[PDB]
RNA sequence: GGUAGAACACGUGGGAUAGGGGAUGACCUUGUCGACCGAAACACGGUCCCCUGCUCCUUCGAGCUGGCAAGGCGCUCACAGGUUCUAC
C-alpha cells in the first residue's frame, strides 16, 4: 500500500495577521521528509517548506514548518493579503510519492458592495447570430451573490450561465461574471433587459436595466 | 536563472499518444532528479513519474504503470514524458519540476515549471469569436467606467487574454472559462478605467487561442450616444 | 626403518550471556535497521566511539566498532593424523 497523506482542513478562511496552521497525517512513517507547497491559482507551486521544519531560501519568515511523529503543521504567523494559494504537503520518504488533497486558504475580509455594470450584445455578435449580454459585478466580499435576469419583467432560468475570479492579492474582492445568451430572433423579440443583483454589502437589490436598439 | 519550459501538450484523441518535452535552462538536469507531476482542471496535484541522477532510475505511479514512461537527455538537457493510451482520467496540465540540492534543501521540488496542458477528448478545435463589451454611455457620470472582451465558442482549452499588448495590468479581471451546453468554451475579461479617459486612451484586448492558431485584436470603443 | 620434539597446513568435536562500576575478533560478506555526505532517496563511492578493549616497537603514539542479525574466516580447548625440519 502506497503513503496516503490527509490533510485538514480543506478549505478556511481567517483575516489579515491571523495565525493560521494546515494539519497534514501521514498513513505510515515518513520520517521528516514531507514538504509544503504553496500554489496560485493556474500558477506553479512554489516551495515553501522542506525537511518538515525547514523553510526554503527566501520564504518569508511568516511560513514555519513542524512536525509530531507523523502529523505535519504548515503555520502563517500573520497571515497577509499575498497568502491567497492552496497548500499541498508531499512526502518524499518512499516511491511513489503522494500529495495531500490541499488546503485552499481565503482571506476573510470586510464587506465590500460590488459594483454592477450591464453590456449589452455587440454589433459583431448580432451579425453572428446570437447575442450575449452581460452583467457585471466587480470588488465585491464575501463570494456569495445572487444575479437575476428580467426580460421585459420576467424572469429566467437556464438560460444564464456565470464564473467567479479568485482573490486579488492587494485588495482580498471578487469579481462576478453572468452571461445571459440568446438567439438574435429572441433578443429582437423583447424591448428591455434587466440584471437583478442581490449581495450582503446591499441593502436593496441592485438593478442595472437597458432597452435594446438605443445606444 | 534556473527555468524549466515545458511543451508537447495539446488535444489528443481518447487512446491516442503524446510525448511531453521538458527543457532545462541554468542548470544540467544530469545532476538532478527530475519530477513529473499533473494536476486536473479544480483538482489537487497528482504525482506522475521521477527519474534520478546519476543511475536513471525511474519511479511511476500507480495509475499511470505501463502506459507512460519518463525519460531524460543530458546532452540535450531536457526530460521526457512518453505517454500512451490516453484516457479521460489523464486530462490535465502536467508540471516538470526539479529535486532541489540535498545540501540546499532536502528533498523538494524548489524549481517547477508553468505546465503544459493536455486534453483527452474526441472532440475538434474551434476558433473563438471575440465580441467588445463597450463602456455604457448611460453609466451615472461615475469616476470609473468598465469596458471588456467576450471570447465565445472555442475549444479546447485556453485561451490568453491581455490588454494593450500586455500594457494594463491594474484592474484586469479575465474570469475562468465556463463550459456552455454546445460543448464549448466562453469567457469574458473586463478592466476598469477612469472614465475622463474613454475619449483619449485607445483600449484594445489581445485575445490568442494557440490550438486554433487565432490572434485577435479588438478595440472597444464605446458607442455613439 | 626406530624414538622424541618443533614449524607449518589440515580434519573432527566443543567454547564465546554482560561497555563507562567496561561489550566485542572493535575481521570479511550479505540481509537488515538508521541518520548524514559526494550536485547523489535506488544503484555507485563514502561518514557517523570521547572512554574502553585488542594489536603493533606508528608506542606523548598509530590502527581496528552507527546498531542488529546470519554465514564464513579467525581466536581458544581436546583428540589424533599429514608434510617438512631438527636431535638421539
Known amino acids: 500500500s502506497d503513503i496516503q497523506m490527509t490533510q485538514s482542513p480543506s478549505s478556511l478562511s481567517a483575516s489579515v495577521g491571523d495565525r493560521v496552521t494546515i494539519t497534514c497525517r501521514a498513513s505510515?512513517?515518513?520520517?521528516?521528509?514531507v514538504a509544503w507547497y504553496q500554489q496560485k491559482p493556474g500558477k506553479a507551486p512554489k516551495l515553501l517548506i522542506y525537511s518538515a521544519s525547514s523553510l526554503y531560501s527566501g520564504v518569508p519568515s511568516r511560513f514555519s514548518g513542524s512536525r509530531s511523529g507523523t502529523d505535519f503543521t504548515l503555520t502563517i504567523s500573520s497571515l497577509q493579503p499575498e497568502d491567497f494559494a492552496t497548500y499541498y504537503c508531499?512526502?518524499?520518504?518512499?516511491?511513489?510519492?503522494?500529495f495531500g488533497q490541499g488546503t485552499k486558504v481565503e482571506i476573510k475580509r470586510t464587506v465590500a458592495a460590488p459594483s454592477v455594470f450591464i453590456f449589452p450584445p455587440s454589433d459583431e455578435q448580432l451579425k453572428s447570430g446570437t447575442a450575449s449580454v452581460v452583467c457585471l459585478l466587480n470588488n465585491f466580499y464575501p463570494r456569495e451573490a445572487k444575479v437575476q435576469w428580467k426580460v421585459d419583467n420576467a424572469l429566467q432560468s437556464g438560460n444564464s450561465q456565470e464564473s467567479v475570479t479568485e482573490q486579488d492579492s492587494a485588495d482580498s474582492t471578487y469579481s462576478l461574471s453572468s452571461t445571459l445568451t440568446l438567439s438574435k430572433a429572441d433578443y429582437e423579440k423583447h424591448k428591455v433587459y434587466a440584471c437583478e443583483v442581490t449581495h450582503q454589502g446591499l441593502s436593496s437589490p441592485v438593478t442595472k436595466s437597458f432597452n435594446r436598439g438605443e445606444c | 536563472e534556473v527555468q524549466l519550459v515545458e511543451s508537447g501538450g495539446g488535444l489528443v484523441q481518447p487512446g491516442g499518444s503524446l510525448r511531453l518535452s521538458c527543457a532545462a535552462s541554468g542548470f544540467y538536469i544530469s545532476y538532478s532528479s527530475i519530477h513529473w507531476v499533473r494536476q486536473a482542471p479544480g483538482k489537487g496535484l497528482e504525482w506522475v513519474a521521477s527519474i534520478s541522477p546519476y543511475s536513471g532510475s525511474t519511479y511511476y505511479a500507480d495509475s499511470v504503470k505501463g502506459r507512460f514512461t519518463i525519460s531524460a537527455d543530458t546532452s540535450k538537457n531536457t526530460a521526457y514524458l512518453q505517454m500512451n493510451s490516453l484516457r479521460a482520467e489523464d486530462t490535465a496540465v502536467y508540471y516538470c519540476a526539479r529535486q532541489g540540492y540535498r545540501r540546499r534543501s532536502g528533498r523538494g521540488f524548489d524549481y517547477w515549471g508553468q505546465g503544459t496542458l493536455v486534453t483527452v477528448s474526441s472532440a475538434s478545435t474551434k476558433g473563438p469569436s471575440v465580441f467588445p463589451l463597450a463602456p455604457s454611455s448611460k453609466s451615472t457620470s461615475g469616476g470609473t467606467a468598465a469596458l471588456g472582451c467576450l471570447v465565445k465558442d472555442y475549444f479546447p482549452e485556453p485561451v490568453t487574454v491581455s490588454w494593450n499588448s500586455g500594457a494594463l495590468t491594474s484592474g484586469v479581471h479575465t474570469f475562468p472559462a465556463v463550459l456552455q451546453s454546445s460543448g464549448l468554451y466562453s469567457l469574458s475579461s473586463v478592466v476598469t478605467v477612469p472614465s475622463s479617459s474613454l475619449g483619449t486612451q485607445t483600449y484594445i484586448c489581445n485575445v490568442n487561442h494557440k490550438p486554433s492558431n487565432t490572434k485577435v485584436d479588438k478595440k472597444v470603443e464605446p458607442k455613439s450616444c
Open positions: 508531499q512526502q518524499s520518504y518512499s516511491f511513489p510519492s503522494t
Open positions: 505510515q512513517s515518513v520520517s521528516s521528509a
